[PDB]
């Protein structure tokens, strides 16, 4: 028993991280097959980032302007292209540690593991969630760009995130592995603000089902409510409105515990309107919302 | 910026995880060079765990009775031996994915990453700390035995923990890679208590420094305190007494933020007496004690 913020093993992703240098700028790259993926702003200087013309800057670059290295050995760039905000560097050698992989664009509320890297070497792994405002609460320093987020399905590595920038609020924005930014953010060094963030309601409920499955049940009351009554109280606390799909996703967790979903919302509505009164759930004095329903089942069984 | 409970990269440890089966019991093993390390209770049935005689049970076992499987390759056992509470199975070939490694016994209050494994396959990685009562608050199910905890200095893996059992209170206990249990626990399925736990004080202060590094500074007050006055508050709230060694180890973090150590103790002293007043520190409503001073510096400098 027990419940930890658990991240996927990072072994299959470690074998793909390289170091990409263009001029004086260095970041991390993703070496899949004979292509290296990296944030396109690697071709920009500090003065370029204030208003970059990526199409004009990239065309003035040749294959020898990029220094790619996996560990110590070098990789010869034989071609370069751009796809949205991700640079694609063609190399002469295919990565012998390329795993079965996919490029997915996840939805807000989904979770993934992050492998924080610097200069092509991993620094640590942790679990993240795509916030409703299309940001992530990560742990990134200078040189962390190019780090990727991922999930593991059996033997397949689903790449869903590539790190690009830190907003002034301390949160982080990035793209999928096709270059399309999550949210309305751009890769320009101009003032950008993440929208009003909300709480992933279906993840809070799944975390409450995890506490029951682990024996924490002091919060279960004896009342019930409706989706209309709950969402009315949910909106005042900046909680995402609960839809019927969310009720269905909580289905399997409700079956194993024998606690109805609308019953669990009433306990949450009471936990919101009355606070936690200093008590703890699964070792937390707040309401945790970075566990999807699928993560709860995958960890408890 | 930001601050997450970050675990070490687990690639080097993944290549050493194999499956060990003895009859119907299956658990995980650590394959380093030509030796597979696993908990010795894999040789026990459910009836033997009530009062096992491991020497007698091991004598009735032969090399071919140990089924060691590494993914899809089946390893050939050429010998077996017992060291304390771990079984050492010598296999046919040396593990080609063996990293540079060491066997270390960690102290209470220190941290490490756990690679949870089932049937020899890695399931996930998370960071945790050895509690002062020599237990860990982990996440383990049936079949998780054999999973290991580790640290990475540079390229060398410091194995420090191997999982063995879950206690009645829901916490977990295990041994080092030499078979010596952390704590007063024996590998027999009879009631065992972990004893009273405490809160790792130096870790909380290091976490407070991590909050100031990341722009979280509302808890800084206009008060200071002495080492003795702080420990009176600490013993009241079941915190480990702060020593001079703890003050010295916090030096580097005190220099990076400009906050004196005794000033930070004053801010922690106020938080212990008054609470948080409905606010958060690094996204937490509790005082976190699973970050050592070295964990903060490693994460905040990369
Ligand atoms: C610090 N500001 C930014 O990171 C940033 C901000 C904006 C807009 C809000 C103004 C836009 C971009 N942009 O368009 O790329 C930004 N990206 C810069 C410029 C390009 C090259 C990567 C670099 N970022 C980092 O190296 C970095 C990433 C991170 O997660 N955390 C850090 C912590 C400490 C120092 C640096 C970073
Ligand atoms: C549940 N009790 C124990 O785990 C346990 C307790 C004691 C004493 C305090 C009473 C001693 C041992 N022992 O000597 O091995 C124990 N170990 C058992 C018996 C041997 C074979 C491994 C097995 N462990 C697990 O399958 C298991 C490990 C875990 O982390 N969490 C689980 C969650 C749910 C069900 C099982 C487990």
Which DSSP string do the residues of B106-131 spell out, in sequence order?
PPTT-EEEEEEEETTEEEEEEEEE--
Q: How buried is residue B174: exposed, middle or buried, by Cβ count under 10 Å (0-12/13-18/19+)?
A: buried
Report CA(A13)–ligand 1 centroid distance (Å): 23
Q: Per the residue annotation, which of A16, A117, A145, A265 is the catalytic one?
A: A145
Which strand (E) or helix (H) includes residue A296? helix A293-300
| DSSP 8-state code for residue A107 | P
Q: Are strands B157-166 and B101-103 parallel, antiparallel or unpaired?
A: parallel
Which strand (E) or helix (H) includes residue B149? strand B148-152
A 10 A CB-CB count for A95 gives: 19
Tokens encoding A271: 């936990």
Distance from C-alpha of B264 to C-alpha of B270, rounded to nearest angstrom: 10
Is B112 in contact with B150 (CB distance < 8 Å)?
Answer: yes
Q: Are strands B25-32 and B17-22 parallel, antiparallel or unpaired?
A: antiparallel
Residue nearest to atom 25 of ligand 1 (CA): A142
| DSSP 8-state code for residue B134 | S
Angle at A221 between CA A200 and CA A214, to 5 degrees: 65
Angle at A181 between CA A80 and CA A45, to 5 degrees: 55
Tokens encoding A199: 């709480």
Contacting residues of A for B138, CB less than 8 Å apart: 2, 4
Tokens encoding A19: 């170091």
Q: How buried is residue B119: exposed, middle or buried, by Cβ count under 10 Å (0-12/13-18/19+)?
A: middle
> Given the structure tokens 């079941």, which residue do they identify?
B238
Torsion angles phi and psi, residue A115, rounded to 5: -110, 100
Is B250 in contact with B205 (CB distance < 8 Å)?
Answer: yes
CA atoms within 13 A on the CB side of B171: 23
Distance from C-alpha of B194 to C-alpha of B197, rounded to nearest angstrom: 8
| DSSP 8-state code for residue B171 | -
Q: Is A181 in the pocket of ligand 1 (CB under 6 A)?
A: no
Angle between helices B261-274 and B201-213 (to 10 degrees): 100
Residue nearest to atom 5 of ligand 2 (CA): B165
Residue nearest to atom 8 of ligand 1 (CA): A189
Distant-in-sequence, close-in-space partners of A20: CB < 8 Å, separation ≥ 6: A26, A27, A28, A29, A36, A38, A42, A66, A67, A68, A89, A120, A146
Closest listed ligand to the CA of B42: 2
* Nearest alpha carbon to residue B157 among B10, B2, B39: B10
A 10 A CB-CB count for A76 gives: 12
Q: Per the residue annotation, which of B38, B41, B160, B164 is the catalytic one?
A: B41
Give strand pairing partners of B240.
none
Tokens encoding A72: 């110590």
Q: Is A259 in the pocket of ligand 1 (CB under 6 A)?
A: no
Contacting residues of B for A3, CB less than 8 Å apart: 139
Closest listed ligand to the CA of A24: 1
Tokens encoding A257: 């515990």
Distance from C-alpha of B56 to C-alpha of B66, rounded to nearest angstrom: 16
Is B163 in contact with B172 (CB distance < 8 Å)?
Answer: yes
Distance from C-alpha of A93 to C-alpha of A70, rounded to nearest angstrom: 11
Torsion angles phi and psi, residue A51, rounded to 5: -165, 75
Contacting residues of A for B115, CB less than 8 Å apart: 9
How many angstroms is the resolution? 2.3
DSSP string computed for A39-73: EGGGG--TTGGGS--HHHHHHT--GGGEEEEETTE
Q: Has A41 been annotated as catalytic?
A: yes
Is A156 in contact with B20 (CB distance < 8 Å)?
Answer: no
Q: How buried is residue A196: exposed, middle or buried, by Cβ count under 10 Å (0-12/13-18/19+)?
A: exposed
Distance from C-alpha of B269 to C-alpha of A96, rounded to nearest angstrom: 54
Q: Has B145 been annotated as catalytic?
A: yes
> Which atom from ligand 2 is nearest to the alpha carbon of B52?
14
Distance from C-alpha of B239 to C-alpha of B231, rounded to nearest angstrom: 8
- Structure determined via: X-ray
> Given the structure tokens 């679990």, which residue do they identify?
A127
Q: How buried is residue A224: exposed, middle or buried, by Cβ count under 10 Å (0-12/13-18/19+)?
A: middle
A 10 A CB-CB count for A195 gives: 12
Report CA(A135)–ligand 1 centroid distance (Å): 14
* Nearest alpha carbon to residue A103 among A120, A119, A116, A86: A86
Residue nearest to atom 9 of ligand 2 (CA): B167
Contacting residues of A for B1, CB less than 8 Å apart: 139-141, 166, 170
| DSSP 8-state code for residue B40 | G
Distance from C-alpha of B175 to C-alpha of B148, rounded to nearest angstrom: 9
For chain A, how far is it from start to end, CA to CA, in angstroms? 10
Which residues precede chain breaks (C–N over 2.5 Å) in chain B?
A: none
Question: What are the CA-CA distances from residue A171 to residues A7, A135, A195, B1 (Å)?
Answer: 19, 6, 11, 8
Q: Are strands B172-175 and B157-166 parallel, antiparallel or unpaired?
A: antiparallel
> Helix (H, G, I), strand (E, B), or coil: what is residue B28?
strand
The distance of Cα B62 from the centroid of its chain, to the nearest Å, equals 32
Distance from C-alpha of A79 to C-alpha of A81, rounded to nearest angstrom: 7
Distant-in-sequence, close-in-space partners of B242: CB < 8 Å, separation ≥ 6: B201, B202, B227, B230, B231, B234, B265
Query: Is the Cα torsion angle B157, B159, B165, B169 positive or negative in sign?
Result: negative
Torsion angles phi and psi, residue B78, rounded to 5: -110, 0
> Given the structure tokens 């090399």, which residue do they identify?
B63
Distance from C-alpha of A11 to C-alpha of A16, rounded to nearest angstrom: 9
Tokens encoding A294: 């699928």
Q: How buried is residue A83: exposed, middle or buried, by Cβ count under 10 Å (0-12/13-18/19+)?
A: middle
Distance from C-alpha of A82 to C-alpha of A58, rounded to nearest angstrom: 8
DSSP string computed for A206-258: HHHHHHHHTT--TT--S----HHHHHHHHHHTTBPPPPHHHHHHTHHHHHHHT
Domains of chain A: 1-14+100-197 (2.40.10.10), 15-99 (2.40.10.10), 198-301 (1.10.1840.10)
Tokens encoding B159: 């194995």
């Amino acid at each position: 028993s027990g419940f930890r913020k658990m991240a996927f093993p990072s072994g299959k992703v470690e074998g793909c991280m390289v170091q990409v240098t263009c001029g004086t700028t260095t970041l991390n790259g993703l070496w899949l097959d004979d292509v290296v993926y990296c944030p396109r702003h690697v071709i920009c200087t500090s003065e370029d980032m204030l208003n970059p013309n990526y199409e004009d800057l990239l065309i003035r670059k040749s294959n020898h302007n990029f220094l790619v290295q996996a560990g110590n050995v070098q990789l010869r760039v034989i071609g370069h292209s751009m796809q949205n905000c991700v640079l694609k560097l063609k190399v002469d050698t295919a990565n012998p540690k390329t795993p079965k992989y996919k490029f997915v664009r996840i939805q807000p509320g989904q979770t993934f593991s992050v492998l924080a890297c610097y200069n092509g070497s991993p620094s640590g792994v942790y679990q993240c969630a795509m916030r409703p405002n299309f940001t992530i609460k990560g742990s990134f320093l200078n040189g962390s760009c190019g780090s990727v987020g991922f999930n593991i399905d059996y033997d397949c590595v689903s790449f869903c995130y590539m790190h690009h920038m830190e907003l002034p609020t301390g949160v982080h924005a990035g793209t999928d592995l096709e270059g399309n930014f999550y949210g309305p953010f751009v890769d320009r060094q101009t003032a950008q603000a993440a929208g009003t963030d909300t709480t992933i309601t279906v993840n809070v409920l799944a975390w409450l089902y995890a506490a029951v499955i682990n024996g924490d049940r002091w919060f279960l009351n004896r009342f019930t409510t409706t989706l209309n009554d709950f969402n009315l109280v949910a909106m005042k606390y900046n909680y995402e409105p609960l839809t019927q799909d969310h009720v269905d996703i909580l289905g399997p967790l409700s079956a194993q515990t024998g606690i109805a979903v609308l019953d669990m919302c009433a306990s949450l509505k009471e936990l919101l309107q009355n606070g936690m009164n200093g008590r703890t759930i699964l070792g937390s004095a707040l309401l945790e919302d970075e566990f999807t329903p699928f993560d709860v089942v995958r960890q408890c069984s």
